[PDB]
mmCIF file of C-alpha atoms and ligand atoms in Angstrom:
data_model
loop_
_atom_site.group_PDB
_atom_site.id
_atom_site.type_symbol
_atom_site.label_atom_id
_atom_site.label_comp_id
_atom_site.label_asym_id
_atom_site.label_seq_id
_atom_site.Cartn_x
_atom_site.Cartn_y
_atom_site.Cartn_z
ATOM 1 C CA UNK C 1 0.415 -32.684 10.306
ATOM 2 C CA UNK C 2 -2.376 -30.217 9.509
ATOM 3 C CA UNK C 3 -2.868 -29.415 5.901
ATOM 4 C CA UNK C 4 -5.473 -28.974 3.159
ATOM 5 C CA UNK C 5 -6.380 -32.519 2.230
ATOM 6 C CA UNK C 6 -9.560 -34.544 2.946
ATOM 7 C CA UNK C 7 -7.882 -36.101 5.953
ATOM 8 C CA UNK C 8 -6.040 -33.158 7.515
ATOM 9 C CA UNK C 9 -7.855 -30.147 6.129
ATOM 10 C CA UNK C 10 -9.896 -27.299 7.504
ATOM 11 C CA UNK C 11 -12.746 -29.542 8.725
ATOM 12 C CA UNK C 12 -10.285 -31.401 11.012
ATOM 13 C CA UNK C 13 -8.384 -28.435 12.436
ATOM 14 C CA UNK C 14 -10.687 -27.864 15.399
ATOM 15 C CA UNK C 15 -9.569 -31.141 17.059
ATOM 16 C CA UNK C 16 -6.043 -29.824 17.564
ATOM 17 C CA UNK C 17 -6.899 -26.107 17.535
ATOM 18 C CA UNK C 18 -10.296 -25.680 19.171
ATOM 19 C CA UNK C 19 -10.224 -21.880 18.510
ATOM 20 C CA UNK C 20 -11.118 -23.018 14.983
ATOM 21 C CA UNK C 21 -14.770 -22.717 16.145
ATOM 22 C CA UNK C 22 -14.126 -19.304 17.938
ATOM 23 C CA UNK C 23 -15.822 -15.989 17.827
ATOM 24 C CA UNK C 24 -13.498 -14.118 15.459
ATOM 25 C CA UNK C 25 -12.272 -16.628 12.872
ATOM 26 C CA UNK C 26 -11.101 -15.820 9.371
ATOM 27 C CA UNK C 27 -11.615 -15.716 6.499
ATOM 28 C CA UNK C 28 -15.190 -14.483 6.055
ATOM 29 C CA UNK C 29 -17.493 -13.641 3.216
ATOM 30 C CA UNK C 30 -17.640 -9.892 2.720
ATOM 31 C CA UNK C 31 -21.225 -8.970 1.996
ATOM 32 C CA UNK C 32 -20.810 -5.693 0.194
ATOM 33 C CA UNK C 33 -24.395 -4.618 0.895
ATOM 34 C CA UNK C 34 -24.074 -5.154 4.670
ATOM 35 C CA UNK C 35 -20.623 -3.594 5.120
ATOM 36 C CA UNK C 36 -20.902 -0.026 6.229
ATOM 37 C CA UNK C 37 -18.812 2.903 5.142
ATOM 38 C CA UNK C 38 -17.049 4.240 8.258
ATOM 39 C CA UNK C 39 -16.116 7.902 7.845
ATOM 40 C CA UNK C 40 -13.937 7.679 10.910
ATOM 41 C CA UNK C 41 -11.364 5.285 9.334
ATOM 42 C CA UNK C 42 -8.137 7.329 8.870
ATOM 43 C CA UNK C 43 -6.359 7.007 5.580
ATOM 44 C CA UNK C 44 -4.288 3.757 4.968
ATOM 45 C CA UNK C 45 -0.494 4.220 4.815
ATOM 46 C CA UNK C 46 1.538 1.559 3.049
ATOM 47 C CA UNK C 47 5.248 2.523 3.424
ATOM 48 C CA UNK C 48 7.280 -0.130 1.611
ATOM 49 C CA UNK C 49 10.066 2.064 0.104
ATOM 50 C CA UNK C 50 12.744 0.697 2.470
ATOM 51 C CA UNK C 51 11.521 -2.932 2.386
ATOM 52 C CA UNK C 52 14.375 -5.484 2.595
ATOM 53 C CA UNK C 53 13.354 -8.887 1.196
ATOM 54 C CA UNK C 54 15.563 -11.823 2.136
ATOM 55 C CA UNK C 55 14.451 -15.258 1.113
ATOM 56 C CA UNK C 56 11.606 -17.287 -0.405
ATOM 57 C CA UNK C 57 10.662 -20.529 1.328
ATOM 58 C CA UNK C 58 8.316 -23.476 0.522
ATOM 59 C CA UNK C 59 7.005 -24.393 3.985
ATOM 60 C CA UNK C 60 4.796 -27.283 2.778
ATOM 61 C CA UNK C 61 1.619 -25.093 2.911
ATOM 62 C CA UNK C 62 2.480 -22.126 0.713
ATOM 63 C CA UNK C 63 5.581 -20.174 -0.260
ATOM 64 C CA UNK C 64 6.666 -17.337 1.940
ATOM 65 C CA UNK C 65 8.716 -14.270 0.937
ATOM 66 C CA UNK C 66 10.442 -13.098 4.154
ATOM 67 C CA UNK C 67 11.602 -9.577 5.026
ATOM 68 C CA UNK C 68 13.972 -8.040 7.507
ATOM 69 C CA UNK C 69 11.717 -6.846 10.277
ATOM 70 C CA UNK C 70 14.551 -5.963 12.792
ATOM 71 C CA UNK C 71 13.710 -2.224 12.150
ATOM 72 C CA UNK C 72 10.815 -0.114 10.773
ATOM 73 C CA UNK C 73 11.714 -0.634 7.069
ATOM 74 C CA UNK C 74 8.400 -1.624 5.532
ATOM 75 C CA UNK C 75 5.376 -0.653 7.638
ATOM 76 C CA UNK C 76 1.607 -0.408 7.513
ATOM 77 C CA UNK C 77 -0.130 2.370 9.499
ATOM 78 C CA UNK C 78 -3.384 4.289 9.414
ATOM 79 C CA UNK C 79 -6.752 2.955 8.380
ATOM 80 C CA UNK C 80 -8.188 1.056 11.385
ATOM 81 C CA UNK C 81 -4.759 0.640 12.939
ATOM 82 C CA UNK C 82 -3.246 2.299 15.988
ATOM 83 C CA UNK C 83 0.459 2.554 15.820
ATOM 84 C CA UNK C 84 2.992 0.882 13.569
ATOM 85 C CA UNK C 85 2.916 -2.572 11.985
ATOM 86 C CA UNK C 86 6.093 -4.088 10.517
ATOM 87 C CA UNK C 87 6.071 -6.239 7.375
ATOM 88 C CA UNK C 88 7.472 -9.687 8.175
ATOM 89 C CA UNK C 89 6.444 -11.745 5.143
ATOM 90 C CA UNK C 90 3.981 -12.336 2.366
ATOM 91 C CA UNK C 91 2.436 -15.424 0.873
ATOM 92 C CA UNK C 92 -0.552 -16.493 -1.231
ATOM 93 C CA UNK C 93 -3.435 -18.954 -1.136
ATOM 94 C CA UNK C 94 -4.607 -20.347 -4.488
ATOM 95 C CA UNK C 95 -6.737 -22.875 -6.218
ATOM 96 C CA UNK C 96 -6.575 -25.853 -8.508
ATOM 97 C CA UNK C 97 -8.806 -23.938 -11.013
ATOM 98 C CA UNK C 98 -9.312 -20.220 -11.665
ATOM 99 C CA UNK C 99 -12.763 -20.290 -10.003
ATOM 100 C CA UNK C 100 -11.446 -20.863 -6.485
ATOM 101 C CA UNK C 101 -8.465 -20.103 -4.334
ATOM 102 C CA UNK C 102 -9.174 -16.989 -2.307
ATOM 103 C CA UNK C 103 -9.894 -17.240 1.401
ATOM 104 C CA UNK C 104 -12.080 -14.112 1.689
ATOM 105 C CA UNK C 105 -15.004 -14.044 -0.665
ATOM 106 C CA UNK C 106 -16.973 -11.004 -1.948
ATOM 107 C CA UNK C 107 -20.719 -11.604 -2.087
ATOM 108 C CA UNK C 108 -19.755 -15.329 -2.167
ATOM 109 C CA UNK C 109 -17.448 -14.714 -5.159
ATOM 110 C CA UNK C 110 -14.157 -16.690 -4.946
ATOM 111 C CA UNK C 111 -11.114 -15.275 -6.645
ATOM 112 C CA UNK C 112 -8.270 -17.399 -8.141
ATOM 113 C CA UNK C 113 -5.938 -16.473 -5.365
ATOM 114 C CA UNK C 114 -5.325 -14.169 -2.412
ATOM 115 C CA UNK C 115 -2.141 -12.413 -1.371
ATOM 116 C CA UNK C 116 -1.473 -11.795 2.332
ATOM 117 C CA UNK C 117 1.089 -9.240 3.432
ATOM 118 C CA UNK C 118 1.625 -10.019 7.185
ATOM 119 C CA UNK C 119 2.615 -7.244 9.641
ATOM 120 C CA UNK C 120 3.038 -7.182 13.417
ATOM 121 C CA UNK C 121 2.393 -4.450 15.958
ATOM 122 C CA UNK C 122 5.810 -3.054 17.047
ATOM 123 C CA UNK C 123 4.443 -2.217 20.516
ATOM 124 C CA UNK C 124 4.704 -5.942 21.250
ATOM 125 C CA UNK C 125 8.402 -6.144 20.407
ATOM 126 C CA UNK C 126 8.420 -9.399 18.383
ATOM 127 C CA UNK C 127 6.086 -11.494 16.243
ATOM 128 C CA UNK C 128 5.689 -14.262 18.724
ATOM 129 C CA UNK C 129 4.443 -11.807 21.384
ATOM 130 C CA UNK C 130 2.232 -10.007 18.898
ATOM 131 C CA UNK C 131 0.225 -13.131 17.971
ATOM 132 C CA UNK C 132 -0.839 -13.469 21.657
ATOM 133 C CA UNK C 133 -2.630 -10.058 21.417
ATOM 134 C CA UNK C 134 -6.012 -9.167 19.883
ATOM 135 C CA UNK C 135 -4.362 -6.298 17.975
ATOM 136 C CA UNK C 136 -1.075 -7.997 17.370
ATOM 137 C CA UNK C 137 -1.177 -8.441 13.540
ATOM 138 C CA UNK C 138 -2.455 -6.572 10.534
ATOM 139 C CA UNK C 139 -2.816 -8.625 7.336
ATOM 140 C CA UNK C 140 -3.318 -6.805 4.071
ATOM 141 C CA UNK C 141 -5.241 -9.018 1.720
ATOM 142 C CA UNK C 142 -5.302 -8.602 -2.043
ATOM 143 C CA UNK C 143 -7.389 -10.666 -4.430
ATOM 144 C CA UNK C 144 -5.979 -12.066 -7.651
ATOM 145 C CA UNK C 145 -8.095 -12.496 -10.779
ATOM 146 C CA UNK C 146 -6.848 -14.125 -13.948
ATOM 147 C CA UNK C 147 -6.410 -11.688 -16.809
ATOM 148 C CA UNK C 148 -3.410 -9.680 -17.858
ATOM 149 C CA UNK C 149 0.004 -10.465 -16.372
ATOM 150 C CA UNK C 150 1.214 -8.705 -13.240
ATOM 151 C CA UNK C 151 4.772 -7.640 -14.046
ATOM 152 C CA UNK C 152 5.687 -7.124 -10.416
ATOM 153 C CA UNK C 153 4.824 -10.816 -9.719
ATOM 154 C CA UNK C 154 7.008 -12.318 -12.372
ATOM 155 C CA UNK C 155 10.197 -12.348 -10.243
ATOM 156 C CA UNK C 156 8.258 -14.489 -7.764
ATOM 157 C CA UNK C 157 6.860 -16.848 -10.433
ATOM 158 C CA UNK C 158 10.333 -17.265 -12.040
ATOM 159 C CA UNK C 159 11.971 -18.480 -8.802
ATOM 160 C CA UNK C 160 9.330 -21.132 -7.912
ATOM 161 C CA UNK C 161 10.953 -23.928 -9.802
ATOM 162 C CA UNK C 162 13.928 -23.559 -7.324
ATOM 163 C CA UNK C 163 11.704 -24.193 -4.291
ATOM 164 C CA UNK C 164 9.419 -26.906 -5.608
ATOM 165 C CA UNK C 165 9.263 -29.010 -2.521
ATOM 166 C CA UNK C 166 8.750 -28.519 1.244
ATOM 167 C CA UNK C 167 11.818 -27.169 3.028
ATOM 168 C CA UNK C 168 13.437 -25.637 -0.029
ATOM 169 C CA UNK C 169 14.427 -21.990 0.083
ATOM 170 C CA UNK C 170 16.121 -19.525 -2.219
ATOM 171 C CA UNK C 171 17.728 -16.099 -1.928
ATOM 172 C CA UNK C 172 15.090 -13.422 -2.660
ATOM 173 C CA UNK C 173 16.779 -10.113 -2.106
ATOM 174 C CA UNK C 174 15.943 -6.792 -3.688
ATOM 175 C CA UNK C 175 12.271 -7.640 -4.326
ATOM 176 C CA UNK C 176 9.858 -4.653 -4.187
ATOM 177 C CA UNK C 177 6.470 -5.646 -2.801
ATOM 178 C CA UNK C 178 4.936 -2.407 -4.105
ATOM 179 C CA UNK C 179 4.648 -4.131 -7.451
ATOM 180 C CA UNK C 180 2.012 -6.427 -6.030
ATOM 181 C CA UNK C 181 -0.533 -3.732 -5.115
ATOM 182 C CA UNK C 182 -3.509 -2.538 -7.090
ATOM 183 C CA UNK C 183 -3.982 1.173 -7.883
ATOM 184 C CA UNK C 184 -6.633 1.830 -5.215
ATOM 185 C CA UNK C 185 -6.232 1.283 -1.497
ATOM 186 C CA UNK C 186 -10.005 1.233 -0.881
ATOM 187 C CA UNK C 187 -10.619 -1.562 1.654
ATOM 188 C CA UNK C 188 -12.807 -3.523 3.969
ATOM 189 C CA UNK C 189 -11.749 -4.185 7.556
ATOM 190 C CA UNK C 190 -12.838 -6.492 10.341
ATOM 191 C CA UNK C 191 -11.342 -8.238 13.394
ATOM 192 C CA UNK C 192 -10.321 -11.840 12.788
ATOM 193 C CA UNK C 193 -7.736 -14.541 12.979
ATOM 194 C CA UNK C 194 -4.864 -16.371 11.270
ATOM 195 C CA UNK C 195 -6.380 -18.635 8.599
ATOM 196 C CA UNK C 196 -4.007 -21.526 9.324
ATOM 197 C CA UNK C 197 -3.216 -23.263 12.588
ATOM 198 C CA UNK C 198 -2.752 -22.011 15.263
ATOM 199 C CA UNK C 199 -5.766 -19.915 14.114
ATOM 200 C CA UNK C 200 -5.027 -17.241 16.727
ATOM 201 C CA UNK C 201 -7.498 -14.366 17.028
ATOM 202 C CA UNK C 202 -4.894 -11.648 16.687
ATOM 203 C CA UNK C 203 -5.490 -10.083 13.233
ATOM 204 C CA UNK C 204 -6.928 -6.826 12.038
ATOM 205 C CA UNK C 205 -7.892 -7.740 8.499
ATOM 206 C CA UNK C 206 -7.580 -5.110 5.794
ATOM 207 C CA UNK C 207 -8.866 -6.513 2.449
ATOM 208 C CA UNK C 208 -8.460 -4.357 -0.642
ATOM 209 C CA UNK C 209 -11.507 -3.917 -2.850
ATOM 210 C CA UNK C 210 -9.589 -3.811 -6.059
ATOM 211 C CA UNK C 211 -8.115 -7.170 -7.176
ATOM 212 C CA UNK C 212 -4.885 -7.352 -9.115
ATOM 213 C CA UNK C 213 -4.809 -9.182 -12.418
ATOM 214 C CA UNK C 214 -2.341 -11.990 -13.008
ATOM 215 C CA UNK C 215 -1.953 -14.167 -16.069
ATOM 216 C CA UNK C 216 -3.165 -17.763 -16.334
ATOM 217 C CA UNK C 217 0.537 -18.620 -16.958
ATOM 218 C CA UNK C 218 1.558 -16.977 -13.690
ATOM 219 C CA UNK C 219 -1.053 -18.809 -11.519
ATOM 220 C CA UNK C 220 -0.352 -22.074 -13.392
ATOM 221 C CA UNK C 221 3.163 -21.888 -12.079
ATOM 222 C CA UNK C 222 1.921 -21.544 -8.473
ATOM 223 C CA UNK C 223 0.122 -24.806 -9.064
ATOM 224 C CA UNK C 224 3.319 -26.653 -9.989
ATOM 225 C CA UNK C 225 4.667 -26.366 -6.479
ATOM 226 C CA UNK C 226 4.520 -29.341 -4.149
ATOM 227 C CA UNK C 227 3.236 -29.773 -0.607
ATOM 228 C CA UNK C 228 5.565 -32.758 -0.176
ATOM 229 C CA UNK C 229 9.299 -32.854 0.503
ATOM 230 C CA UNK C 230 11.876 -33.917 -2.062
ATOM 231 C CA UNK C 231 11.868 -37.650 -2.715
ATOM 232 C CA UNK C 232 8.245 -38.089 -1.638
ATOM 233 C CA UNK C 233 5.322 -38.774 -3.850
ATOM 234 C CA UNK C 234 4.110 -35.658 -5.578
ATOM 235 C CA UNK C 235 1.121 -33.785 -4.167
ATOM 236 C CA UNK C 236 0.519 -30.597 -6.067
ATOM 237 C CA UNK C 237 0.291 -27.453 -3.894
ATOM 238 C CA UNK C 238 -3.198 -26.382 -4.878
ATOM 239 C CA UNK C 239 -6.297 -25.409 -2.858
ATOM 240 C CA UNK C 240 -4.334 -24.171 0.130
ATOM 241 C CA UNK C 241 -7.202 -21.967 1.268
ATOM 242 C CA UNK C 242 -9.543 -22.118 4.272
ATOM 243 C CA UNK C 243 -13.237 -21.499 3.432
ATOM 244 C CA UNK C 244 -15.313 -18.680 4.838
ATOM 245 C CA UNK C 245 -16.146 -18.903 8.594
ATOM 246 C CA UNK C 246 -19.153 -17.592 10.546
ATOM 247 C CA UNK C 247 -19.172 -13.801 10.926
ATOM 248 C CA UNK C 248 -20.747 -14.057 14.403
ATOM 249 C CA UNK C 249 -20.877 -10.778 16.270
ATOM 250 C CA UNK C 250 -18.699 -8.733 13.901
ATOM 251 C CA UNK C 251 -19.148 -5.825 11.560
ATOM 252 C CA UNK C 252 -17.164 -5.374 8.394
ATOM 253 C CA UNK C 253 -16.406 -1.696 7.738
ATOM 254 C CA UNK C 254 -15.717 -0.043 4.357
ATOM 255 C CA UNK C 255 -13.227 2.782 3.827
ATOM 256 C CA UNK C 256 -15.142 3.943 0.759
ATOM 257 C CA UNK C 257 -18.756 4.687 -0.205
HETATM 258 CL CL1 YIP X 1 7.753 -2.025 -7.775
HETATM 259 C C1 YIP X 1 7.053 -0.460 -7.431
HETATM 260 C C2 YIP X 1 5.697 -0.244 -7.596
HETATM 261 C C3 YIP X 1 5.167 0.998 -7.317
HETATM 262 C C4 YIP X 1 5.946 2.044 -6.859
HETATM 263 C C5 YIP X 1 7.290 1.831 -6.685
HETATM 264 O O1 YIP X 1 8.154 2.834 -6.215
HETATM 265 C C6 YIP X 1 7.495 4.090 -5.992
HETATM 266 C C7 YIP X 1 8.506 5.040 -5.482
HETATM 267 N N1 YIP X 1 8.877 5.157 -4.186
HETATM 268 N N2 YIP X 1 9.839 6.119 -4.186
HETATM 269 N N3 YIP X 1 10.020 6.544 -5.459
HETATM 270 N N4 YIP X 1 9.179 5.875 -6.290
HETATM 271 C C8 YIP X 1 7.826 0.589 -6.970
HETATM 272 CL CL1 YIP X 2 4.027 -15.157 9.437
HETATM 273 C C1 YIP X 2 2.563 -16.103 9.368
HETATM 274 C C2 YIP X 2 2.119 -16.636 10.555
HETATM 275 C C3 YIP X 2 0.992 -17.420 10.635
HETATM 276 C C4 YIP X 2 0.300 -17.683 9.481
HETATM 277 C C5 YIP X 2 0.756 -17.163 8.285
HETATM 278 O O1 YIP X 2 0.128 -17.429 7.071
HETATM 279 C C6 YIP X 2 -1.243 -18.047 6.943
HETATM 280 C C7 YIP X 2 -2.284 -16.996 7.244
HETATM 281 N N1 YIP X 2 -2.790 -16.624 8.429
HETATM 282 N N2 YIP X 2 -3.638 -15.625 8.139
HETATM 283 N N3 YIP X 2 -3.630 -15.366 6.811
HETATM 284 N N4 YIP X 2 -2.787 -16.246 6.261
HETATM 285 C C8 YIP X 2 1.910 -16.396 8.219
HETATM 286 ZN ZN1 ZN X 3 -2.569 -16.230 4.347
#
């Protein structure tokens, strides 16, 4: 029964998931004047040409777009990563108002939303094994600012009224996640965790510097989803983000100068 409310939100998670107060929790604030350019980072390789999307699901916390990860069809390699990471799903975190919603912040700036493309290290064979390893996942994070519409998001926005409530799903084939990326792949990277329970410390975070722009109409539609199931009282799916956690003994590295 974790969630994002006053009574079951981020401040309560540690009682069921004590790793909530661990040494490598996410998200963090990215202090752009303390991050250091690392000339050793190899270039980032986002290979989504063969991506096979399947389904979109409201899981009561966000909506997830799921991919076929039974072969190397959509992979992330390079940058800080060793080996090959398979795209399994993406989802977003967003706010009730345009001034909040992202999980990562940039010099304490909150964006309206944040997209997470989740990938797992194929040397571990399956997702459930990968999340038990310190290098099991790579999450590519992309900020959303409100401005011009993002055409490659509109197929997502248009389907949300079919999955309004928890447990609803819809076919979501033939969706190209390349349409969600910004132009630049400049990024920050640091070792961290899942940002929801179980909060496992298994993620290499790769957060793109360049946000994408979405329209106020597009993000407004995110906010019409529901955390509740059908035939329950309505609780709008807004503010499904965890705030910044202590950086502790970690360094955030920049791919760019
Ligand atoms: Cl939605 C989208 C966005 C950006 C690039 C895309 O395809 C690029 C490509 N890959 N192979 N030929 N063109 C597709
Ligand atoms: Cl497949 C998956 C597994 C666990 C958590 C997920 O989404 C929330 C999250 N964790 N880190 N960034 N977002 C997604
Ligand atoms: Zn996420």
